């Protein structure tokens, strides 16, 4: 089995600087060339940087030049990319991949570069009334992810979890809603289970009628 | 090196035919990949060197080339295609992507089926309420959802939020949150929310009187 896994990355201050690694498996980095491309959210792909572990040669993008710096350690079969001065431009997600067409990919760290505090969300309950609809509230947060599940992973069928929406704060809210018959309100329990890893927040909240 | 995409967005039944041109600005030889990616995700190769099938994609896709015209076509559409894909140069660093092209699955109309969530205790605790409207399940993606605080129709205290296409039934489903301060809330009884959908006759009116 082969794959890629990036670490590294969250919330930096504006000209702050972070770093990171993307492990490699199955493969030698040196037999290929290894590529970090970004992306915006909702905004498209843009390359930034590419490198061949075996010689060391860096190849960049001059919307990154200079502030950026992608290293290679062969005998640890990890690429790096080293960033300073980071701008609210170049908040996206940051992926890893390998050449020759770019084939197996990395699920991707996220950086985010603001001047926001990181906060944990506040986790409200919304009851059905009188099919019935229930869900939960996720408030003022940030940075992102946030996992929401329902009953640990039990409940799965007609669950809708609405992306994050930007608020007049600076900080973010998202909902997240199942579609249960009216029937399961009184004898059937629903929890659902909130996760925010940037505050290390962690909330389950049984939503009742 | 400049890429171009065309269609920017897309909407095509299952079944169907969907063709997809990419423009380069300058030569680019055979250099091209073709890119698929689901909502966040990763980008997964579909077409290597602008005609080669990747191990792995159905024989459905395919790659052509005129040029500095490349074309990916589908020849059978599924539903469990709904994604943005990409045209990516690697003649010349820099590789330069294309804008995207979201497809969306076409489907026949679906009302929406709405509730209204009125504020709960703890956030009215906290000092701000929220009213969320629920739209569930719907098709087009198109919906006016108004807001009516004692029969007042608001303005720009909403924020909407929709899913992406359901993987089985290609609907789409949406929130309207109204976020007031509490001390608003607590002046005003009718809270109604009104959708108006080309799946619904006439706007449904989902609404709750504090104090229920
Ligand atoms: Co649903
Ligand atoms: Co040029």
């Known amino acids: 089995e082969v794959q890629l896994v990036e670490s590294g990355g969250g919330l930096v201050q504006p000209g702050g600087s972070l770093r990171l690694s993307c492990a490699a498996s199955?493969?030698?980095?040196?037999?290929?060339?290894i590529h970090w491309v970004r992306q915006a959210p909702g905004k498209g792909l843009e390359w930034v940087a590419r490198?061949?572990?075996?010689?060391?040669?860096?190849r960049y993008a001059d919307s990154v030049k200079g502030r950026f710096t992608i290293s290679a350690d062969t005998s640890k079969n990890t690429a790096y990319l080293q960033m300073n001065s980071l701008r609210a431009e170049d908040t996206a997600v940051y992926y890893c991949?390998?050449?020759?067409?770019?084939?197996?990919w990395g699920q991707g760290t996220l950086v985010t570069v603001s001047s926001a505090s990181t906060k944990g969300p506040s986790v409200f309950p919304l009851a059905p009334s009188s099919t019935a609809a229930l869900g939960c509230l996720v408030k003022d947060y940030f940075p992102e992810p946030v996992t929401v599940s329902w009953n640990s992973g039990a409940l799965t069928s007609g669950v809708h979890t609405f992306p994050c929406v930007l608020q007049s704060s600076g900080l973010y809210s998202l909902s997240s809603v199942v579609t249960v018959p009216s029937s399961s309100l009184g004898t059937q329990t629903y929890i659902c289970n909130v996760n925010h890893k940037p505050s290390n927040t962690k909330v389950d909240k049984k939503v009742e009628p | 090196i400049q890429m171009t995409q065309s269609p920017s967005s897309l909407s095509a039944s299952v079944g169907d035919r969907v063709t997809i041109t990419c423009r380069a600005s300058?030569?680019?030889?055979?250099?091209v990949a073709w890119y698929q990616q689901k909502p966040g995700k990763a980008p997964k190769l579909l077409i290597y060197?602008?005609?080669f099938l990747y191990s792995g994609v159905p024989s459905r896709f395919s790659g052509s080339r005129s040029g500095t015209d490349f074309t990916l076509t589908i020849s059978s559409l599924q539903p469990e295609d709904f994604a943005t894909y990409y045209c990516?140069?690697?003649?010349?660093?820099?590789?330069?992507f294309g804008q995207g092209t979201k497809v969306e699955i076409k489907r026949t109309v679906a009302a929406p089926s709405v509730f209204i969530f009125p504020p709960s205790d703890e956030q009215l605790k906290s000092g701000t309420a929220s009213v969320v409207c629920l739209l569930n399940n719907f098709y087009p993606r198109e919906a006016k959802v108004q807001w009516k605080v004692d029969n007042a129709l608001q303005s720009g205290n909403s924020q909407e939020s929709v899913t992406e296409q359901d993987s089985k039934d290609s609907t789409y489903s949406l929130s309207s949150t109204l976020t007031l301060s509490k001390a608003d809330y607590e002046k005003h009884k009718v809270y109604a929310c009104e959708v108006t959908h080309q799946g619904l006759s006439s706007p449904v009116t989902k609404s709750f009187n504090r104090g229920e």
């Open positions: 991949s390998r050449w020759y067409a770019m084939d197996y």
């Open positions: 199955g493969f030698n980095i040196k037999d290929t060339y």
């Open positions: 490198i061949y572990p075996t010689n060391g040669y860096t």
């Open positions: 300058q030569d680019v030889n055979t250099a």
């Open positions: 060197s602008a005609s």
């Open positions: 990516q140069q690697h003649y010349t660093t820099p590789p330069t």
